[PDB]
């Protein structure tokens, strides 16, 4: 299955207040590197005054980054970048299949 899947991302953050220092540093620090690596993303990096900071992606996947730090916020962006649109549902079976065989499945015949 060849396609990109994270079809859009947001980094909502603040500009006044000590909470969003980590995400602000993240902004100038490692946005451009990841972005130049990933053109397929629509990384629209808007703001939201006075509110505790978070990230969002494709559905809706939200990740708070309050009182966090850039070295980790980079990973917490690359998570979302690798991710699907999945909801977290504990694995059913490790190898999904619609065709399990070439020989016929076992019946009264050998």
């Amino acid at each position: 299955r060849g396609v990109w899947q994270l079809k859009k991302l947001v980094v909502s953050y603040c500009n006044w207040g000590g909470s969003s220092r980590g995400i602000r540093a993240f902004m100038e620090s490692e946005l451009p590197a990841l972005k130049e690596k990933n053109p397929q993303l629509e990384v629209i990096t808007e703001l939201s005054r006075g509110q505790h900071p978070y990230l969002k992606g494709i559905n809706e996947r939200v990740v708070c980054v309050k009182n966090m730090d850039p070295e980790e916020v980079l990973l917490n962006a690359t998570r979302l970048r690798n991710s699907l649109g999945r909801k977290v549902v504990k694995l059913r079976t490790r190898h999904v299949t619609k065709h399990p065989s070439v020989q016929g499945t076992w019946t009264t015949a050998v």
Binding site: P100, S101, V102, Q103, G104, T105, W106, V110
Partner: protein, 106 residues
């Protein structure tokens, strides 16, 4: 807090074990230990589950489980139990060839 993230797991319980707390905490404080016993228990529960198949679908071809595995380990087929069971399940002809190869020891 925990006071509601219990009432998140509690879905499905019977009695007042789903609404009230002083009872929810109990059927749930077990409802985790059982899951510990089975994330240590399924890995083995399934183990025996596998052999039974191979056992049956080879005893169909004469070789008994012990002879089968003996022959295969000795002539170096490091295929392992899960996929041996899946071929037992889904591949009568290749599995039959396997049984013959392991009869090519004893």
């Amino acid at each position: 807090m925990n006071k509601k993230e219990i009432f998140k797991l509690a879905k499905g319980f019977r009695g007042r074990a789903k609404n009230c707390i002083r009872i929810a905490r109990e059927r749930v404080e077990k409802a985790l230990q059982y899951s510990y016993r089975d994330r240590r228990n399924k890995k083995r529960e399934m183990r025996g589950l596998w052999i039974e198949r191979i056992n049956a679908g080879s005893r169909q071809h004469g070789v008994n489980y012990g002879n089968f595995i003996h022959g295969l380990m000795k002539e170096n087929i490091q295929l392992n139990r899960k996929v041996l069971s899946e071929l037992s399940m889904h591949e009568p002809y290749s599995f039959k060839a396997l049984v013959d190869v392991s009869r090519k020891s004893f």
